[PDB]
Write a protein that binds this ligand. Structure first.
Ligand code: HEM
Length: 388
């Protein structure tokens, strides 16, 4: 039985070597997390994929003996509840609605870059570009006006940063978010609005509709899934580019690589801490390393699947030219990221915008001077200074 956390802490974007060791010699690894009883950890692409997408695993029926690192959401529902929720949400999250945002993303990011450029280097990628970009996008989806972007950014930070804010602070922020969303929903029930939240309020599946509680809870989910995830992923992707100079140079010389570079950076860059939420088997499931019986918990992180040499050639080397890229960074199957198209657009706009504005873009300090976050759900730099 392997104890998590593993011995030795990782710096920056490094992947703990134990996962690779387990992938080759212990593909159905018995593990003991800080809380709950023993579970299984899977690290091979096929197994991780199965764990996170096969309908024989449940996200809803977690319990006390469920392995976990800690003592409502669509992310935690199973079919058929999940299926109903997802059908309604997909009336708003459409390719047509997301794709029509392209121009507005470009102008939003260009304004943020102008301000950075006016102020002069060094700037902080995290505070000056990534965070304000992604919160603005989610505020547009929710109908939150420009003047309240800062308020949402702050409230999101509070409920997300579980080690930096107290339970009482998180309760207060959540209450504030929900009160604001309740007012937005109430306005959207009085007359149709065309923002994504107004479209969700108007969405119908025969007679079925989202309740006020489901709408409000989904607004909260959108701050964590859409803003916080995107902001951290973007900062980490920029760090990775700025520390892989040959790859960054290649992207400048060959800008048509940008879409593949974004997919490769999604595959490569770690976001969380390598465990993920347990899934519980509703029924026996044969995986590569053996059989998971009904009732047993399985942890499976996409980051480990995305380094499996069974699925990617030379997986521990960043290669932005990779054409075949079936990474699991947005998941797979029923829970597949509802915002993937928009996330991809965001990452292309930001990275493409950054490289075009700043040919001389570089870290403003050596990498050993970047301080990395230590608690909470996300890896990321505390501050990421750049110069140009
Ligand atoms: C770089 C950005 C992003 C990454 C890496 C990311 C990744 C993910 C992942 C891994 C999942 C879970 C897949 C699973 O559990 O099987 C997910 C779910 C989700 N994402 Fe994202 N996401 C990103 C951006 C966004 C954005 C911009 C939005 C909305 C505008 C969004 C909305 C969602 C929603 C609603 C779900 C839940 C879907 C469900 O449970 O059925 N995401 N995302």
């Amino acid at each position: 039985v392997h104890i998590y956390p593993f011995e030795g802490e990782v710096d920056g974007l490094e992947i703990h070597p134990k996962f690779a060791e387990l992938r080759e010699t212990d593909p159905l690894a018995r593990v003991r997390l800080p809380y709950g009883g023993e579970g299984w950890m899977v690290t091979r692409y096929d197994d991780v994929r199965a764990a996170n997408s096969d309908p024989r695993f449940s996200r809803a029926q977690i319990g006390e003996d469920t392995p976990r690192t800690t003592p409502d959401t669509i992310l935690s529902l199973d079919p058929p509840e999940h299926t109903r929720l997802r059908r309604l949400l997909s009336k708003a999250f459409t390719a047509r609605r997301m794709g029509a945002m392209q121009s507005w993303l470009e102008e939003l990011f260009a304004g943020l870059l102008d301000g950075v450029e006016r102020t002069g280097h060094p700037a902080d990628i995290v505070r000056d570009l990534a965070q304000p970009f992604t919160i603005a996008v989610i505020c547009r989806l929710l109908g939150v006006p420009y003047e309240d972007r800062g308020r949402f950014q702050h409230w999101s930070e509070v409920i997300m940063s579980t080690t930096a804010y107290s339970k009482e602070e998180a309760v207060s922020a959540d209450a504030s978010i929900r009160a604001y969303l309740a007012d937005l929903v109430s306005a959207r029930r009085a007359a149709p609005h065309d923002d994504l939240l107004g479209v969700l309020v108007s969405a119908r599946d025969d007679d079925d509709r989202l309740t006020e509680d489901e709408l409000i809870t989904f607004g909260v989910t959108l701050l964590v899934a859409g803003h916080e995830t995107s902001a951290h992923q973007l900062g980490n992707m920029v760090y990775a580019l700025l520390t892989h100079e040959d790859q960054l140079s290649l992207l400048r010389e060959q800008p048509e690589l940008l879409p593949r570079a974004v997919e490769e950076l999604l595959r490569f860059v770690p976001l969380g801490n390598g465990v993920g939420n347990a899934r519980i088997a509703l029924e026996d499931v044969e995986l590569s390393g053996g059989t998971v019986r009904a009732g047993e918990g399985v942890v499976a992180a996409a980051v480990n699947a995305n380094r499996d040499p069974r699925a990617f050639d030379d997986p521990d080397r960043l290669d932005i030219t990779r054409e075949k890229n079936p990474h699991l960074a947005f998941g797979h199957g029923a829970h597949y990221c509802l915002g993937a198209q928009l996330a991809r657009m965001e990452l292309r706009v930001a990275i493409g915008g950054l490289l075009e504005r700043f040919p001389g873009l570089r870290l403003a300090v050596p990498a050993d001077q970047v301080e990395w976050k230590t608690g909470g759900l996300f890896r990321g730099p505390q501050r990421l200074p750049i110069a140009w």
